[PDB]
Scaffold this active site. Structure first.
Site, mmCIF file in Angstrom:
data_model
loop_
_atom_site.group_PDB
_atom_site.id
_atom_site.type_symbol
_atom_site.label_atom_id
_atom_site.label_comp_id
_atom_site.label_asym_id
_atom_site.label_seq_id
_atom_site.Cartn_x
_atom_site.Cartn_y
_atom_site.Cartn_z
ATOM 1 N N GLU A 135 -4.805 4.172 -10.722
ATOM 2 C CA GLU A 135 -5.643 2.987 -10.547
ATOM 3 C C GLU A 135 -6.808 2.999 -11.528
ATOM 4 O O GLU A 135 -7.099 1.986 -12.177
ATOM 5 C CB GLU A 135 -6.164 2.908 -9.109
ATOM 6 C CG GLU A 135 -5.098 2.762 -8.034
ATOM 7 C CD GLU A 135 -5.697 2.751 -6.618
ATOM 8 O OE1 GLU A 135 -6.201 1.685 -6.192
ATOM 9 O OE2 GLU A 135 -5.642 3.800 -5.945
ATOM 10 N N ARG A 191 0.024 4.506 3.000
ATOM 11 C CA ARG A 191 0.109 4.292 4.444
ATOM 12 C C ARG A 191 0.592 5.497 5.245
ATOM 13 O O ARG A 191 0.677 5.374 6.472
ATOM 14 C CB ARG A 191 1.020 3.110 4.755
ATOM 15 C CG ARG A 191 0.505 1.781 4.279
ATOM 16 C CD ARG A 191 1.517 0.685 4.574
ATOM 17 N NE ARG A 191 2.563 0.577 3.549
ATOM 18 C CZ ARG A 191 3.712 -0.077 3.718
ATOM 19 N NH1 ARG A 191 3.986 -0.659 4.889
ATOM 20 N NH2 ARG A 191 4.602 -0.146 2.715
ATOM 21 N N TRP A 236 -9.025 6.641 -0.689
ATOM 22 C CA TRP A 236 -9.310 7.371 -1.904
ATOM 23 C C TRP A 236 -8.320 6.923 -2.980
ATOM 24 O O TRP A 236 -7.290 6.310 -2.698
ATOM 25 C CB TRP A 236 -9.269 8.874 -1.652
ATOM 26 C CG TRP A 236 -8.026 9.296 -0.993
ATOM 27 C CD1 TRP A 236 -6.810 9.490 -1.590
ATOM 28 C CD2 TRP A 236 -7.840 9.570 0.397
ATOM 29 N NE1 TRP A 236 -5.883 9.868 -0.655
ATOM 30 C CE2 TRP A 236 -6.484 9.925 0.573
ATOM 31 C CE3 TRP A 236 -8.682 9.547 1.515
ATOM 32 C CZ2 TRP A 236 -5.955 10.268 1.819
ATOM 33 C CZ3 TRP A 236 -8.155 9.887 2.758
ATOM 34 C CH2 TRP A 236 -6.804 10.246 2.896
ATOM 35 N N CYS A 263 0.835 -1.200 0.000
ATOM 36 C CA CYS A 263 0.000 0.000 0.000
ATOM 37 C C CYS A 263 0.870 1.250 0.000
ATOM 38 O O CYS A 263 1.620 1.494 0.951
ATOM 39 C CB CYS A 263 -0.949 0.019 1.204
ATOM 40 S SG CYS A 263 -1.928 1.546 1.311
#
Ligand code: HEM
Ligand code: HEM
Ligand SMILES: Cc1cc(N)nc(-c2cc(CN3CCC(F)(F)CC3)cc(F)c2F)c1
Ligand SMILES: Cc1cc(N)nc(-c2cc(CN3CCC(F)(F)CC3)cc(F)c2F)c1
Ligand SMILES: C[C@H](O)[C@H](O)[C@H]1CNc2nc(N)[nH]c(=O)c2N1
Ligand SMILES: C[C@H](O)[C@H](O)[C@H]1CNc2nc(N)[nH]c(=O)c2N1
Ligand SMILES: [Zn+2]
Lengths: 413, 418
Positions: free
Chosen positions: B293, B119, B288, B116
């Site tokens: 992506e 973070r 969000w 991720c």
């Protein structure tokens, strides 16, 4: 006993059995992955160290040619052993040298160009004894490889290491790179990556033109002696002026690049023998120049320049002005090489070919070690097929290896 | 003790936190698996209801960790908690987390998520305890509140809703959707695919459960919620809770005419959350989007919306060979457009330059105070323009810390219907 890799775009699944043959560290442990770590003289192998490494390679070579167990296989084996007993080392035959050099390329997990591995011209320079000799050998390499723009891949192999005190080294990291000069005002003229090597050249007596694209001199070391300077003949260095098919102004950036990528600072390892000077060359993928050479912040750093001429909003990153100017630079690079009929491959073609190569290597060889972190191009990653392709990484030998820079360990005579 | 180096700045960090690693990565000294999607099956607990000698050591470790976090450890409340967890497993074969333990664990699962890039915000997470839930209707109610809180009229906020933990394995709570909000995919008779190809199979299950598809390109899928091992139930999320952004381009007036939109809230709902041996099979979490992506992966993957040719044609691009880089050029314009649209509609979004820069900073923070930060280079580097972002040039160490989010099999490979 088996490992599977999957392409998540196509659903194809391959089965890697070849990884059982690897025998040297990746750097990872069972509880930590070091997949993105870049690098995870008296260390010359002893007699007892060298015996099994040579046995392994000789066995591998006779397996490759469907002569394993043969009379010639067994006699070769004891011939190698005799040399190691007498001389503490041995000499490859010409056939074994060619086989080893091709497989070291075949085994290079970080190289996306390996579909070509079997078409490699090997230049045996093991009879070389002086820096002048090395220069002659390298000029012939460059001229052959360049072939007036119709590039041909090739390697020139200099005498193997002995006691570590008589190494042959090409001190250049590539055979053709441009010089870098740090200015007193903090700025940098030319290629910032080569500033320290440029300083080593100058102090050895090179008279630099102090320009942006000065081809560097060769710095050649034979038999552990001090290295010596030589100027490659300019007619042997093919260069491409970079223009853009739609942007008239792009030629005014004044950019060119050399045609021949020729890595000269790595070490070739065959059967436990260490070839500390083994420069090899192929042809460029466009992004090596367009993304890394031109646009790394530590390199020529021309994004800001090109975006300005493009009239992009550079006040906020979210305009993606960097991404936009990068695509145009990489279009310009490919268009320029193609117009001057100098071999190049774009990242799309190159990655598609590597997938075809991988599947074939799994088919006929049981696998193909591959370093995803390096195989994926440095731009447009997920729209290239290798992005979606699972890869297993392991270290087969013969291999190409990193070695320390010569000036960090050479002691001057 | 291991060092990582950034090759753009020459900053070198020193990792000791990896000594706390618990599970196998998949790699060995002889094979690296760092680009395998699911390299390991090493779990902290066996298949079904574990025996006391199996669950308690995991429990003791999490509680030790948590009381260590708050500068107790050995305190009266810590020693009583151990006896409480022990008596509880003796008498139910499981145990229950205190509210504070649940919050600590969810936040640390996110903090530990090596894949991720987001973070930097790990400790600013809203946690909705739904462990009192009993039915799929209850699950729908909790999910609606989650979506409404998280969306916050475009000023998105991070959240997770945690449903009751796995007990015996035949009573799992599951969101069957992979994300709370996704678009349908329909297999056309001519062999092509309308909508999102990834969801063709889940869309089929929904239709096969009584869902009436509007059969369009952006059909929000119904929720398919499973409570206490029973059959799943369809629910339609109220549309006024599903914020959507229509994609237009700041220069190409024709872009709006492509009729593209995406949703505002990415909410992952198929993962498993593991805390001290407990398994929360239903724990939808949301943050969000990073622009790529949507604009790189969702719109441009070949197995997804595959819009590259259509945008390239509209742009009058030399599409007869790769070396014109027409794909790369269209790809950039699409991502300019997605960003510009979310920002015009004041919906939270972050570009890949801002997000990767933030992660480098998070990395510096984590090493400075925690002794390390696990991070998966293959997943952290964005899928366009990789080397012009700072994470490309950053060495990373990957290792598996607990608590964690884990993958789990799709429930329809496992569920016995009735
Ligand atoms: C024929 C065309 C070739 C292409 C298109 C190609 C492509 C590439 C690229 C893009 C890289 C990564 C370079 C970087 O990002 O800095 C690479 C690495 C490499 N190439 Fe190739 N290559 C070619 C030929 C060769 C040949 C002929 C050899 C040796 C005989 C070779 C050996 C290697 C090795 C050892 C590496 C990795 C070096 C490392 O570990 O850092 N390549 N290749
Ligand atoms: C708040 C802003 C956030 C951003 C910008 C962000 C960004 C990302 C991105 C881009 C990915 C890769 C996804 C993909 O490429 O398919 C990812 C993965 C992931 N995120 Fe975050 N994320 C955020 C919040 C969160 C939160 C709140 C959680 C949990 C509480 C979380 C947990 C995860 C996990 C577990 C993964 C890995 C999933 C897997 O292994 O498949 N993230 N994140
Ligand atoms: C034959 C060949 C073809 C091609 N297109 N590219 C390269 C290449 C390979 C590296 C890898 N290289 C190793 C030495 C190092 F010094 F360690 C730095 C990393 C770097 C480059 F610039 C390169 F052009 C090589
Ligand atoms: C909170 C959050 C924020 C953000 N910007 N992005 C994501 C995200 C994460 C995945 C990872 N995803 C997990 C399920 C899986 F099934 F395991 C496949 C991989 C996928 C997405 F589409 C995502 F938006 C999540
Ligand atoms: C930190 C990271 O390991 C480093 O930037 C790597 C990433 N992948 C790469 N891939 C290629 N082809 N060339 C590189 O120099 C690098 N650099
Ligand atoms: C094969 C490879 O591991 C796979 O395609 C990964 C690569 N990196 C990724 N990175 C992110 N952020 N998301 C992904 O889905 C993937 N997919
Ligand atoms: Zn690894």
């Amino acid at each position: 006993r088996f490992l599977k890799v999957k392409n998540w775009e196509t659903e194809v699944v391959l089965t890697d059995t070849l990884h059982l043959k690897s025998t040297l560290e990746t750097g990872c442990t069972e509880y930590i992955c070091m997949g993105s770590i870049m690098h995870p003289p008296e260390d010359v192998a002893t007699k007892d160290q060298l015996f099994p490494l040579a046995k392994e390679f000789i066995d591998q070579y006779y397996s490759s040619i469907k002569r394993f167990g043969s009379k010639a296989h067994m006699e070769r084996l004891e011939e190698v052993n005799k040399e190691i007993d007498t001389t503490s080392t041995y000499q490859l035959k010409d056939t074994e040298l060619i086989y080893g050099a091709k497989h070291a390329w075949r085994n290079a997990s970080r190289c996306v160009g390996r579909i070509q591995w079997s078409k490699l011209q090997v230049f045996d320079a093991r009879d070389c004894t002086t820096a002048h000799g090395m220069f002659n050998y390298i000029c012939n390499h460059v001229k052959y490889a360049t072939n007036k723009g119709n590039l041909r891949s090739a390697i020139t192999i200099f005498p193997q290491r002995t006691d570590g005190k008589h190494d042959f080294r090409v001190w250049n990291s590539q055979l053709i790179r441009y010089a870098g000069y740090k200015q007193p005002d903090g700025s940098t003229l030319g290629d910032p990556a080569n500033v320290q090597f440029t300083e080593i050249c100058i102090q050895q007596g090179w008279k630099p033109p102090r320009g942006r694209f000065d081809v560097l001199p060769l710095l050649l070391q034979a038999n552990g002696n001090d290295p010596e300077l030589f100027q490659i003949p300019p007619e042997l260095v093919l260069e491409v002026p970079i223009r853009h098919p739609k942007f008239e102004w792009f030629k005014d950036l004044g950019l060119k690049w050399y045609g021949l990528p020729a890595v000269s600072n790595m070490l070739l390892e065959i059967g436990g023998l260490e070839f500390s000077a083994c420069p090899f060359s192929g042809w460029y993928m466009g992004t090596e120049i367009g993304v890394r050479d031109y646009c790394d912040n530590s390199r020529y750093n021309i994004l800001e320049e090109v975006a300005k001429k493009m009239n992009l909003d550079m006040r906020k990153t979210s305009s993606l002005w960097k991404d936009q100017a990068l695509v145009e630079i990489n279009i310009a690079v490919l268009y320029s090489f193609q117009s001057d009929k100098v071999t190049i491959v774009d990242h799309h073609s190159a990655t598609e070919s590597f997938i075809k190569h991988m599947e074939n290597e799994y088919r006929c060889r049981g696998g193909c070690p591959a370093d995803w972190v390096w195989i994926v191009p440095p731009m447009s990653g997920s729209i290239t097929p290798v992005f979606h392709q699972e890869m297993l990484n392991y270290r087969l030998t013969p291999s190409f290896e990193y070695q320390p820079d010569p000036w960090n360990t050479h002691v001057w005579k």
